[PDB]
Amino acid sequence: HLHLDPKVREEARRRLLSAKGHLEGILRMLEDEKVYCVDVLKQLKAVEGALDRVGEMVLRAHLKDHVIVEELMEALK
Amino acid sequence: HLDPKVREEARRRLLSAKGHLEGILRMLEDEKVYCVDVLKQLKAVEGALDRVGEMVLRAHLKDHVEEIVEELMEALK
Amino acid sequence: HLDPKVREEARRRLLSAKGHLEGILRMLEDEKVYCVDVLKQLKAVEGALDRVGEMVLRAHLKDHDVEEIVEELMEALK
Amino acid sequence: HLHLDPKVREEARRRLLSAKGHLEGILRMLEDEKVYCVDVLKQLKAVEGALDRVGEMVLRAHLKDHVAIVEELMEAL
């Protein structure tokens, strides 16, 4: 629906690849025996923080374009 | 140590979340992007992550001073 | 500027939120406290605040210097 | 259900009083004619941030106690 600026696209793709790499790390850690509950929670929050950052970039580009409301709101909620 | 059963369930759930994350990557690697669809997919993945975080916290809590609480709050905050 | 009707609705909703907030204050000013209820009341007040922010955001959006506009918004949304 | 430490109680009380003071400020600002949407959103976010701090205080106290139910807590979180 939008031809995203390659710069924002490549930037978002980099942050998600990182998020993905990080999630694969948690998956591997979950293969170990002495894995701590707190470590899992912390790392999950880290992946979440990275996704939020990508969401902001996408939201930014979406708004700049349109600056529709119900659909946007529905997505933010 | 995180319960082995929760560990297994967490692995299964995060593997799917990881697959979902790659779907978002593919959406971005396309020149045309539906920003709101992407925002929704991101929230969906965040929701799946939250559910696993919820499951691990619950087991960690059912299980259960200063050190304990301190580490938990650190993980939560 | 923020729609006059929105400012009005926002004041009414925030006045109740404030009244709710004082209730949490009274709960704490009590030597005996139900932690779980206090956590629930807080989340309830947080929800009322969110609904007001939601209303204000919506009106702000329905209305819409693109660059500057988005910059400020994202700054508010933080 | 719990005889909260006067120290924590007075601290949570002080922070809520400030939160309330801040909310009454927003209410007054909403009486002005040139109020900006972003300012309201920002200040509301500030009130929320202060409420989160009091909750983290109440949660820490709740946890220390019970570590020394899970459904009710999760339910509240």
C to A contact (≥3 Cβ pairs closer than 8 Å): yes
Q: Which of A35, A30, D30 is nearest to C17 (CA)?
A: D30
Determine the straight-line distance between the first and last CA of chain C, rounded to whole angstroms. Answer: 20
Experiment type: X-ray
Q: Which of D46, C48, D38, C61 is nearest to A59 (CA)?
A: C61
Tokens of D13: 């009380």
Q: Residue D62 corresponds to which amino acid?
A: H
State the Cα–Cα distance between residues B1 and A33, nearest whole angstrom.
7
Resolution given for this structure, in angstroms: 2.1
Q: Which residue of A has its CA nearest to B5?
A: A30
* Residue B51 touches partner A, C-beta closer than 8 Å: no
Give the chains touching A; criterion: ≥3 Cβ pairs < 8 Å.
Answer: B, C
CA distance to A16, A25, B26, per residue, from B29 (Å): 11, 23, 5
A58, B46: Cβ pair inside 8 Å?
no
Tokens of A30: 């979950």
Contact D70, B58 (CB under 8 A): yes
Question: Which residues of A1-77 form beta strands (DSSP E)?
Answer: 2-3
CA angle A33, A38, A44 (to 5 degrees): 95
Tokens of B27: 């959406």
State the Cα–Cα distance between residues B37 and C37, nearest whole angstrom.
37
Contact D26, D40 (CB under 8 A): yes
For B62, the closest of D64, D68, D70 (CB atoms) is: D70
Q: How far is C65 from chain D (nearest CA, A)?
A: 15
What CATH number labels C1-78?
A: 1.20.58.1000
- Give the rounded distance of the alpha carbon of B66 from its chain centre: 27
Tokens of A67: 């600056």
Q: How many CB atoms lie within 10 A of CB D42?
A: 17
Dihedral in degrees, nearest 10, Cα atoms B41, C40, C52, D57 = -90
Tokens of B67: 């050190």
What CATH number labels D1-77?
A: 1.20.58.1000
- Where are the domains positioned within chain B? 1-77
Mutate to test the interface with B, among D57, D60, D71, D73 (most CBs of B within 10 A): D60
Kindly give, in sequence order, each residue whose CB lies less than 8 Å from that of residue D25, ignoring residues fewer than 6 positions away. Answer: D43
CA distance to A53, A64, D44, D53, D54, per residue, from C41 (Å): 30, 37, 17, 14, 11
